[PDB]
Each structure stands twice: as C-alpha cells, then as structure tokens.
Structure 1
C-alpha cells in the first residue's frame, strides 16, 4: 500500500525468511556430523568384546 507500515512488515518478511534459511542450511552442516557418528557407532564393536 502506499504506507510506511506495509513496507516495514515486508521488511520483517524478508528478514524472518533469511533467518530460517541460515538455520536450515546449517542443519545439513550439523547433521552431516551427527549422521557421521551414527554410521561409526553402528559399525563399532563394544571394546569389551
């Protein structure tokens, strides 16, 4: 709208979206390590045995 408010809400829009993307792109950074463990633990005998 010709408004100062609608622009500002659209600012919140662009802004919150950028936060979500930064997070999910960092998930595949976190998750590649978390998944690396599981495939190590899945193949690792207990030392006692």
Structure 2
C-alpha cells in the first residue's frame, strides 16, 4: 500500500501547473482585451487623417 498511492497524486500532484499554464495567459490574454462592435470600423474609419 506504499507502491500504488504517490504515482497518482505527484503524476496528478506534480502536473497542477500542468493545471497552471492556460489560466494565467487569458487573466491578462482575458484581463488586457475588451469589446467588439468597435473593432469593425477599425477598418472602416482611419487610414490618412
């Protein structure tokens, strides 16, 4: 009972930052980018000025 029970939570408890590397690149990739309807004339109202 000493062999089977730390291969499943340091395989599953040392891959937590392998549950760490998608949600801090959309909290400022989803916390440095707001909304839409204005991009669309970010290509219909500004080349020359």
Normalising by structure 1, report the TM-score: 0.55
Structure 1 stretches of 4+ moved >2 Å: none
Please name the residue that 2:8 is paired with. 19
Greater share of helix residues, 1 or 2?
1
Aligned residues: 38
Partner of 1:36: 25
Output the aligned Cα RMSD: 1.7
Indicate how the Cα distance of structure 1 residues 25 and 48 shifts in structure 2: closer, same or farther if over 3 A, else same.
farther
TM superposition score normalised by structure 2? 0.55
- 5+ long unaligned stretches in structure 2: 39-49
